[PDB]
Each structure stands twice: as structure tokens, then as C-alpha cells.
Design an enzyme around this catalytic site. Structure first.
Site, PDB file in Angstrom:
ATOM      1  N   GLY A 169       0.808  -1.190   0.000  1.00 26.26           N
ATOM      2  CA  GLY A 169       0.000   0.000   0.000  1.00 26.26           C
ATOM      3  C   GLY A 169       0.844   1.244   0.000  1.00 26.26           C
ATOM      4  O   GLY A 169       1.936   1.284  -0.567  1.00 26.26           O
TER       5      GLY A 169
ATOM      6  N   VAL B 181       2.746   4.800   1.164  1.00 27.00           N
ATOM      7  CA  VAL B 181       3.727   5.353   2.085  1.00 27.00           C
ATOM      8  C   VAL B 181       3.692   6.866   2.034  1.00 27.00           C
ATOM      9  O   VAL B 181       3.775   7.445   0.954  1.00 27.00           O
ATOM     10  CB  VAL B 181       5.155   4.876   1.782  1.00 27.00           C
TER      11      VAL B 181
ATOM     12  N   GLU C  79      12.032   5.598  10.088  1.00 27.18           N
ATOM     13  CA  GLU C  79      12.853   6.804   9.908  1.00 27.18           C
ATOM     14  C   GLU C  79      12.742   7.268   8.470  1.00 27.18           C
ATOM     15  O   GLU C  79      12.592   6.460   7.557  1.00 27.18           O
ATOM     16  CB  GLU C  79      14.325   6.588  10.271  1.00 27.18           C
TER      17      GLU C  79
ATOM     18  N   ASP D 270      12.702  -8.519  -2.250  1.00 24.01           N
ATOM     19  CA  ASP D 270      12.218  -7.584  -3.281  1.00 24.01           C
ATOM     20  C   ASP D 270      13.093  -6.364  -3.394  1.00 24.01           C
ATOM     21  O   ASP D 270      12.625  -5.239  -3.450  1.00 24.01           O
ATOM     22  CB  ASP D 270      10.768  -7.157  -3.029  1.00 24.01           C
TER      23      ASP D 270
ATOM     24  N   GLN E  14      14.097   1.701  -5.673  1.00 26.89           N
ATOM     25  CA  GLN E  14      13.106   2.436  -4.846  1.00 26.89           C
ATOM     26  C   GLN E  14      13.103   2.007  -3.383  1.00 26.89           C
ATOM     27  O   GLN E  14      12.532   2.725  -2.547  1.00 26.89           O
ATOM     28  CB  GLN E  14      11.679   2.334  -5.408  1.00 26.89           C
ATOM     29  N   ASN E  15      13.731   0.862  -3.066  1.00 31.58           N
ATOM     30  CA  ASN E  15      13.903   0.380  -1.681  1.00 31.58           C
ATOM     31  C   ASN E  15      15.244   0.768  -1.052  1.00 31.58           C
ATOM     32  O   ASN E  15      15.532   0.324   0.030  1.00 31.58           O
ATOM     33  CB  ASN E  15      13.808  -1.179  -1.630  1.00 31.58           C
TER      34      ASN E  15
HETATM   35  C1  LIG Z   1      11.308   2.088   0.516  1.00 29.15           C
HETATM   36  C2  LIG Z   1      10.043   2.798   0.027  1.00 29.15           C
HETATM   37  O1  LIG Z   1       8.656   2.356   0.361  1.00 29.15           O
HETATM   38  C3  LIG Z   1       9.960   4.288   0.561  1.00 29.15           C
HETATM   39  C4  LIG Z   1       8.751   5.111   0.122  1.00 29.15           C
HETATM   40  O2  LIG Z   1       9.991   4.332   2.010  1.00 29.15           O
HETATM   41  C5  LIG Z   1      10.674   5.389   2.558  1.00 29.15           C
HETATM   42  N1  LIG Z   1      10.986   6.505   1.895  1.00 29.15           N
HETATM   43  C6  LIG Z   1      11.695   7.450   2.502  1.00 29.15           C
HETATM   44  N2  LIG Z   1      12.023   8.579   1.905  1.00 29.15           N
HETATM   45  C7  LIG Z   1      11.954   8.880   0.608  1.00 29.15           C
HETATM   46  C8  LIG Z   1      11.579   7.992  -0.417  1.00 29.15           C
HETATM   47  C9  LIG Z   1      11.535   8.450  -1.739  1.00 29.15           C
HETATM   48  C10 LIG Z   1      11.854   9.773  -2.033  1.00 29.15           C
HETATM   49  S1  LIG Z   1      11.855  10.338  -3.679  1.00 29.15           S
HETATM   50  N3  LIG Z   1      13.212   9.815  -4.381  1.00 29.15           N
HETATM   51  O3  LIG Z   1      11.817  11.834  -3.761  1.00 29.15           O
HETATM   52  C11 LIG Z   1      10.433   9.704  -4.606  1.00 29.15           C
HETATM   53  C12 LIG Z   1      10.179  10.330  -5.995  1.00 29.15           C
HETATM   54  C13 LIG Z   1       9.369  10.803  -4.760  1.00 29.15           C
HETATM   55  C14 LIG Z   1      12.196  10.656  -1.028  1.00 29.15           C
HETATM   56  C15 LIG Z   1      12.261  10.197   0.277  1.00 29.15           C
HETATM   57  N4  LIG Z   1      12.088   7.299   3.773  1.00 29.15           N
HETATM   58  C16 LIG Z   1      11.809   6.250   4.489  1.00 29.15           C
HETATM   59  C17 LIG Z   1      11.074   5.268   3.866  1.00 29.15           C
HETATM   60 BR1  LIG Z   1      10.641   3.631   4.729  1.00 29.15          BR
END
Ligand SMILES: C[C@@H](O)[C@@H](C)Oc1nc(Nc2ccc([S@](=N)(=O)C3CC3)cc2)ncc1Br
Length: 285
Positions: free
Chosen positions: A16, A18, A76, A122, A126-127
């Protein structure tokens, strides 16, 4: 959820949505994950074990909030993901020393989680999350198993695609290997649009596996004797302009046989990492 003020949606997929969020009364800025649905008890126990699991290259799971029979996870917050960072660096490329740092730390994260028998499963750009300080951390470790989760195929180990039900920590090394190569070349290594196309992109590059390189492969659940037989290509063609040390480590991260695939521990000792350092990236936030 009433303790948190949503700021913006920063992701979506399996589990879902975030959100970046602020704790209405502490002021802390966090990443809030609403899990997609009460919540089975085994999932609660397992996620509680993951909360214990602290390491500098693993996104800290700050709080598990189980209420109104839903599950929220409070993590975090890091400010950028590796995908956005790779896209922004696409004209120059990420400098090799920063790639090397990021690989080293990421293998530190896996080594740790693997020593606790915790699997990601996975991994993808993006992770993987970065900060201004030159650190990178893995997000969603252990979520797949805690939640019994059964779409991006690009980083999927060949053993998962061929129907192994009981796969090992080696599946994360494979994924990290495909991410290493993508940082270097600035193109995804195996960009499959279906499972067979994923498999076949792997075979066209690394060779069609067989009993010689992978004992047991032809008895795997989705192995078909009718697979075409492609010959393996030179890594010098696959990942120019990575040096021989980097190519040697990548090939060991991309071994077909999960038992021959390098461990994260052994990879940390590979000579590729002899001159590793910790550059800071130029992040535009
Ligand atoms: C791993 C994945 O679900 C993520 C969602 O989770 C987290 N994401 C973040 N921060 C974060 C994730 C993406 C971006 S981004 N590169 O600007 C994206 C294009 C908008 C900026 C900050 N911090 C802890 C977590 Br947990």
C-alpha cells in the site's frame, strides 16, 4: 494515524501507500506505511522481531502501530531514493567511488540481516534510501515473509523465476548485483516485461543455465527442456566501463547456482573494496 499529520505521498506498491508524515506532538518527521488490508497474529510477531533489528544500513523501524485492526509502520525518513538519484545523475553517471561506497554499505546491510536469517526478497532502487551524509540504507527488509507476500521483475533471482519455493539469502545478492550494474551503466541490466521475458533476458546475457553450471536446474518446477539455448556473453560487453575487479565481483554476485553465488560477507572482502571510501553525494532535495 491521529497522532500523525500526512505531508506527502512518497510511494506505493505491495504494502500500500507510504507517506512522509509529522508526529503531531513530538514534531518528528517520519515515513508512515499503512499496510494493505484483523491483522494475522504471525505477522504481528514477525514485524515485532524486525523492530529489534538495528544497523546503520537498514532503515530503522521506529514504531509498529496496530489499531482499529489495521497495521501502520513508522520508519525513519530518508530524503531521497536511489532511483531518483540515478535519474538525476543520468547525464554524468554516479562517480565510481560513490557507487563503490554504496555497494559496500549495502552489502554490510545484507550481511547483517542475513546473519539474523532475515531476507529482503524484493530489492530494487526504490527500496534503497540515501542521505546527505553519504549513507545508503535498505528499506522493507523482512516485510515479504512477515506478511507472507506471494510489479517489477527486473531484480528477481533466476531461482525465484524457475519456481523455487524455498529460496535463500542469495536472492538478495542477485538483486543487489543487478542494481550495481545499473548504477555503472545507467541502464537496467535485465528489464523484463513478463516473467518469461525476464528469464530469457537473463539467459541471453549469462547463458542458458544447465546441469553443468547449476546442478539441479533442469528439475526445477518451471524449468522447461524447450528453453532456447543461448551462449553467455563477456562482462566486458555487459558492464563497460567497470574495472576487472568490479566485473569479477559482479559475476560472483550473478552466479546461477545460489550455492555458488557469493555471500554478502565474502563480498565485503573482495579486492574491489580495497580502496573504498565514503564520498558524499550532491543531492538536490
Ligand atoms: C522504501 C520505500 O517504500 C519508501 C517510500 O519508504 C521510505 N521513503 C523514505 N524517503 C523517501 C523515499 C523516496 C523519495 S523520492 N526519491 O523523492 C520519490 C520520488 C518521490 C524521497 C524520500 N524514507 C523512508 C522510507 Br521507509
Amino acid at each position: 494515524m491521529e497522532n500523525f499529520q500526512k505531508v506527502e505521498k512518497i510511494g506505493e506498491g505491495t504494502y500500500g501507500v507510504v507517506y512522509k508524515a509529522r508526529n503531531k506532538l513530538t514534531g518528528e518527521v517520519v515515513a508512515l506505511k499503512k499496510i494493505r488490508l484483523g491483522v494475522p497474529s504471525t505477522a504481528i510477531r514477525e514485524i515485532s522481531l524486525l523492530k529489534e533489528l538495528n544497523h546503520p544500513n537498514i532503515v530503522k523501524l521506529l514504531d509498529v502501530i496496530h489499531t482499529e485492526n489495521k497495521l501502520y509502520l513508522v520508519f525513519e525518513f530518508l530524503h531521497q531514493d536511489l532511483k531518483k538519484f540515478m535519474d538525476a545523475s543520468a547525464l554524468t553517471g554516479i562517480p565510481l567511488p560513490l557507487i563503490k561506497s554504496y555497494l559496500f554499505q549495502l552489502l554490510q546491510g545484507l550481511a547483517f540481516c542475513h546473519s539474523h536469517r532475515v531476507l529482503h526478497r524484493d530489492l530494487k532502487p526504490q527500496n534503497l534510501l540515501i542521505n546527505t551524509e553519504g549513507a545508503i540504507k535498505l528499506a522493507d527488509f523482512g516485510l515479504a515473509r512477515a506478511f507472507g507476500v506471494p510489479v517489477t521483475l527486473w531484480y528477481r533471482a533466476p531461482e525465484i523465476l524457475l519456481g523455487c519455493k524455498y529460496y535463500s539469502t542469495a536472492v538478495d545478492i542477485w538483486s543487489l548485483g543487478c542494481i550495481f550494474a545499473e548504477m555503472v551503466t545507467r541502464r537496467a541490466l535485465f528489464p523484463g516485461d513478463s516473467e518469461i521475458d525476464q528469464l530469457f533476458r537473463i539467459f541471453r546475457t549469462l547463458g542458458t543455465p544447465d546441469e553443468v553450471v547449476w546442478p539441479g536446474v533442469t528439475s526445477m518446477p518451471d524449468y522447461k527442456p524447450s528453453f532456447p539455448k543461448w551462449a553467455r556473453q563477456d562482462f566486458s560487453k555487459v558492464v563497460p566501463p567497470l574495472d576487472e575487479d568490479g566485473r569479477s565481483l559482479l559475476s560472483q554476485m550473478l552466479h546461477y547456482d545460489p550455492n555458488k553465488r557469493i555471500s554478502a560477507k565474502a563480498a565485503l572482502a573482495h579486492p574491489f573494496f580495497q580502496d573504498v571510501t565514503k564520498p558524499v553525494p550532491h543531492l538536490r532535495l
